[PDB]
Amino acid sequence: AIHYETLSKIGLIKGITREYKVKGTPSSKDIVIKLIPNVTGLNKCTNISMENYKEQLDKILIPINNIIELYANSTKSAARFAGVIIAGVALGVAAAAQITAGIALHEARQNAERINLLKDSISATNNAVAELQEATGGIVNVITGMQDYINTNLVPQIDKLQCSQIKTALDISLSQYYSEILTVFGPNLQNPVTTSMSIQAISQSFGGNIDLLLNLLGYTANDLLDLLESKSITGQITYINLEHYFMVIRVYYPIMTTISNAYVQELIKISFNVDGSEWVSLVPSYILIRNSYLSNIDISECLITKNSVICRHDFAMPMSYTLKECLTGDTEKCPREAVVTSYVPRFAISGGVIYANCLSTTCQCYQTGKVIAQDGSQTLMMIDNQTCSIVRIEEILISTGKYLGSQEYNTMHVSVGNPVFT
Amino acid sequence: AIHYETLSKIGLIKGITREYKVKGTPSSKDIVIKLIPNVTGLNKCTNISMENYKEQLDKILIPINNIIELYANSTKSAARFAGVIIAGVALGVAAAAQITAGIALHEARQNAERINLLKDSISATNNAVAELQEATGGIVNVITGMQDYINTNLVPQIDKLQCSQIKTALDISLSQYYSEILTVFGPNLQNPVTTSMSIQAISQSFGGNIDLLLNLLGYTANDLLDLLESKSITGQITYINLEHYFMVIRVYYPIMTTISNAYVQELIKISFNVDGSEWVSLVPSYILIRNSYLSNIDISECLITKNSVICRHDFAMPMSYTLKECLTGDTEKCPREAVVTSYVPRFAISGGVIYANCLSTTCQCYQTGKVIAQDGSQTLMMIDNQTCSIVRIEEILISTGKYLGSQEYNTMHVSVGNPVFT
Amino acid sequence: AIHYETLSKIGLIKGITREYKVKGTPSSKDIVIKLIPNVTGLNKCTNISMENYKEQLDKILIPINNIIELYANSTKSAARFAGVIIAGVALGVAAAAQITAGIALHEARQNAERINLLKDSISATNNAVAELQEATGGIVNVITGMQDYINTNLVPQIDKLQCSQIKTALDISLSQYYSEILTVFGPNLQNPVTTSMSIQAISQSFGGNIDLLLNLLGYTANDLLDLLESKSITGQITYINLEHYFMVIRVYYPIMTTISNAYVQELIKISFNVDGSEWVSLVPSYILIRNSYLSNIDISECLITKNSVICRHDFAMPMSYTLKECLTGDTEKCPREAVVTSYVPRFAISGGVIYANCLSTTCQCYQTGKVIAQDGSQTLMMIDNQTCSIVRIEEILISTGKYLGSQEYNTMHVSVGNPVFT
Ligand SMILES: *[C@@H]1O[C@H](CO)[C@@H](O)[C@H](O)[C@H]1NC(C)=O
Ligand SMILES: *[C@@H]1O[C@H](CO)[C@@H](O)[C@H](O)[C@H]1NC(C)=O
Ligand SMILES: *[C@@H]1O[C@H](CO)[C@@H](O)[C@H](O)[C@H]1NC(C)=O
Ligand SMILES: *[C@@H]1O[C@H](CO)[C@@H](O)[C@H](O)[C@H]1NC(C)=O
Ligand SMILES: *[C@@H]1O[C@H](CO)[C@@H](O)[C@H](O)[C@H]1NC(C)=O
Ligand SMILES: *[C@@H]1O[C@H](CO)[C@@H](O)[C@H](O)[C@H]1NC(C)=O
Ligand SMILES: *[C@@H]1O[C@H](CO)[C@@H](O)[C@H](O)[C@H]1NC(C)=O
Ligand SMILES: *[C@@H]1O[C@H](CO)[C@@H](O)[C@H](O)[C@H]1NC(C)=O
Ligand SMILES: *[C@@H]1O[C@H](CO)[C@@H](O)[C@H](O)[C@H]1NC(C)=O
Ligand SMILES: *[C@@H]1O[C@H](CO)[C@@H](O)[C@H](O)[C@H]1NC(C)=O
Ligand SMILES: *[C@@H]1O[C@H](CO)[C@@H](O)[C@H](O)[C@H]1NC(C)=O
Ligand SMILES: *[C@@H]1O[C@H](CO)[C@@H](O)[C@H](O)[C@H]1NC(C)=O
């Protein structure tokens, strides 16, 4: 829908076209995270109680468990239709986000309560990572923080150091650990009943070592890194065991869906001449095109890759009528901002040819040494190999190809919009 | 003041009511932070000088000390009124923020200079945490970084490793430490004469272990975690000893005050029908109500909890007249934004009943299988148990209660405002 | 150009004047960063392969190398003019930012390929930091992560711990390392062909220890800390050796240039009386003045110091005509915002004298105890030592000097602009 040949006359140069992708329905796996380390390897020091640490955890876990228990009590299985019934009255107030998550919680807990049957086997581990066998032949991946520090730095020195020295080292390392998770699972976790908690925030519970988790889950996808960086991989707390201080976390792993007839087009903005002074247009850099319709896209929440835009949601936004008219060729409605700085692009390469403002900078033909000048009635000069094979702009020598489009481009005039301030 | 029954007709559904709280007058305690570690346990390696490290610290501490000394010199005790006199001429230019802090500095230094009498006892420590006894029977809590690393990882290996290996390990760990505090106490600290430096930034001087500090200060309050996350706990540098490279920090611990007749009301926004297309209103999610007056609140600087909003300041903001008229029932002045995405809430639960847009999604009665339809003249359909006990929205079964309010709600019509773009 | 005596009547009080500085042409040095550690000290444990780690690195390095190789192939040396010729056709689409960087890449690689001749000597190191001698007598600084951990924590325990315990410790520490650099050199690195990648992001490849790097480069400048915090020090990836898994990084070290006749003037904003209610003006806090012209400055991207503003670019922005008229004395065009909070400055010191709103707060003369009152027709009261030597504002005693300017200030009236909402 965008008329590029005319928009380039006001500094909007067609850039790279990318496919639009949004995540779809996830698969899921359950893991167990243990918050209290095994310190029996330090049992030569009888003054270690771990009592203060347990109390500190209660202040975090109980406030959370009280919410999970509410939704778990409110939902029951369903009859003309199959499904799960959630009690609107019991909740009183709920947004669609928590209603949907509440249903997911109900289903997830049907397995979390089976994992809990291993609570004694979960507590009885001393490795940073352990694999427990379920009665059904399934495998539970247990991730415990602190164990690496204890096993490598404290236990080996149990005879070398004094017991007061070891206790001190342990008390400090535990308070450091607590400070780290408090940030994620403390008061900042407004409502645990969600399916969109970033896995990179959850991973803070074991040092922020996201790679360790992904390797254990067994995610080997070639695009795994893109799913991770786009924040498409998330998890949910489904069960908390307060006595043994461990959590059951469900990890959701999305399937990326490419949207048909949908892509994101970027524009390269350079300055141009209007009346002797230098101006830059105020058109959004990224435009989302679907079927044939123009809309805005909030790229700040998406991952930009070599050939695609990966979003965890559809971030399309409404576009004004004046901007749509601008993009379709009515350049009289494209707003301008004055340039008061030196830090502005004055040239770009697109389609193998150069678009440049040769009044604000100097353009010379390498072959002859002659200056490539534009008049005061022109916005931008377009340079191709029918004009000069190699052009020197500033002190950069750029070779060019042929221009595909109108051959009267440099004799074409364009109207401009009004000056605005932001 | 807000008329909820009419606003719900345009997708503004009453949510959770929270109390408004702002911090009041703090109490205070003094701590000492030492920047240079005790490496005499490594005195078998004679090539350790710590000289380069000291020079690096000078580049941070002197620029700060030069400001503290200025205010300390400018303030003197006071006479019709008691108090402290600050010299406006000596300062030349000062904002109220620094004038107030300057007075606090004067008072704090009356104790910091008494702590400094222990400068030899402060330097003569080798533990990460030490408690020194003052002549008056008071206790000074000394927190030192690096000591944990040195005592646990370097000293125990003094005979096992070569002295060049140990020196290298120490030089690297010190440069890592320096890099961390440089971030907080370097050029980014524009002016040290303040009472609002976050305690979580100060804690970077000893690894970011905020829990260690709080445990030593003896803060056991049940709401301590909320005070910390709301950034209500702050500190001030009151004294710097350049020769022995340590700082005296005053920690301010606020008392939360609940504001009478003041609360924050949240609204849940869902889409609604206007003319066949789908729209969302542009009314702020959080409204601050005081006595009977409406105002805006900058929630981005406050902590949102289950039943309160905790702010370090009063973040009330002016509200326009058109928005006040909107909120009090004149829905013709409530601006609309078009929906161009699929990622929008189309239903919510409030008061035990469901508000939903049954044109954009499908609503069925579980009991009969019949569709619950709304006409093209309606914005939203409200569903209660006088209509259908269990309603299937999408594929989620929700049970409902009775609606408290007008029983003619679903036959009531509302005017809407104009379309706008943002 | 700013008329301060009249603007102070509406709460805009002249603050501190700072010089405007922007970075100029850099010098450069090359360093080598190795991604795979030397684990031959652990060769008693035969189950260490490092194979999985290598594959994980390939997923990061290859996507980057494919871009560097493209620009390296496109550029060739140049003939009426000397220089480097870049192929616009081969690239197809490029912004000025990448065209310029592409030229820098060409030149840098002329040395990177000479460093690569030491690829066997680079791999054959086991220290965290090593200095290799080039055939030309030059020195290559090789920085390797992981070596500190391995040499200090794993190797010394090779006989003490079981080999399965050591392998586990190594596998975990490597996955932690990978997670850290993935953040910087993964998908978030949209295009490696740039000269503006922050050195503090690059330093993440070796723990974020920026001080270690700077010490090795030999930067001893007194203003080094300001260059670092202002983000003026950057680097570029010039060469990647995939077989030996190391990168050659060029570090650019800028020369700060003070701009003639250019400075940034800050204004201190306090509230004032208009008609009995309290108001605050909506004029930008920082104004950039060049020669004699007023413009806006985006201070959010600059470092503010005691006497200067240090920017990596020129961040001047256009200023509206209504604001220029406001600043030059037409106070009728200076917009007002209502105060609905208690958290607002009501006084400030500038020029040794006090400007205060003595209707919203209480002002008393220390010497006599009498109240210093202003009428309802006045905005602000200015207090100097010709009125009262020491004034008590709130409970703060401030001494004053003489006012330099009109002696009829307190009998001068000012017009105000219209109320606005934001
Ligand atoms: C435990 O600590 C106490 C001091 O509080 C000490 O007297 C006791 O000997 C310690 N226990 C052991 C086994 O050392
Ligand atoms: C959930 O139900 C159990 C009884 O089965 C009860 O003990 C628990 O307190 C309830 N939790 C909540 C939040 O109501
Ligand atoms: C600690 O771990 C050890 C070794 O796995 C196990 O024998 C012991 O039962 C565990 N103890 C606790 C308290 O979990
Ligand atoms: C200009 O470039 C095109 C390829 O883009 C080529 O076919 C044509 O021959 C070239 N013309 C000249 C004069 O170099
Ligand atoms: C200190 O370092 C020097 C090398 O600079 C070395 O010759 C000397 O032996 C070292 N001192 C000791 C006690 O090893
Ligand atoms: C403060 O006064 C002392 C003398 O008591 C002087 O040595 C010091 O330099 C002064 N500091 C400042 C910032 O003026
Ligand atoms: C280092 O600490 C030790 C043990 O507390 C003490 O004996 C010594 O005086 C301290 N030395 C220095 C230089 O502070
Ligand atoms: C509807 O719910 C209310 C409680 O909110 C209950 O008192 C009433 O009997 C219910 N009516 C029906 C038909 O279920
Ligand atoms: C390497 O690991 C295997 C188990 O996978 C073990 O059987 C073998 O003994 C180990 N090698 C050595 C030298 O211990
Ligand atoms: C660059 O040229 C070399 C041949 O010299 C080729 O092997 C390599 O694949 C080319 N790289 C790119 C990106 O074209
Ligand atoms: C590892 O480092 C050692 C000691 O510098 C060196 O002898 C050896 O060749 C290195 N091995 C590898 C694989 O780089
Ligand atoms: C007021 O202060 C000035 C210096 O700013 C001084 O010269 C003058 O004598 C002072 N006047 C009185 C009455 O204190």
Numbering used by the authors:
A (entry chain C), B (entry chain B), C (entry chain A): 123 to 200, 204 to 547
From the study:
Langya virus (LayV) was recently found in shrews and isolated from febrile patients in China, representing the first human-infecting HNV from shrew origin. HNV infections are facilitated by the attachment glycoprotein (G) and the fusion glycoprotein (F). Upon G-mediated receptor engagement, F is triggered and promotes membrane fusion and viral entry.
NiV, HeV, Ghanaian virus (GhV), and Cedar virus (CedV) utilize a subset of ephrin receptors to gain entry into host cells. We decided to investigate the portability of this disulfide bond to GhV F, which shares 55% and 47% amino acid sequence identity with NiV F and LayV F, respectively. Similar to LayV F, the GhV S196C/A215C F disulfide mutant led to enhanced expression of prefusion F, relative to wildtype GhV F, underscoring that this strategy is broadly generalizable to HNV F glycoproteins. We describe here the computational design of LayV G constructs, enabling high-yield recombinant production of the LayV G ectodomain tetramer, and show that a disulfide stapling HNV F trimers in the prefusion state is a broadly applicable F prefusion-stabilization, enabling future preclinical evaluation of vaccine candidates against LayV.
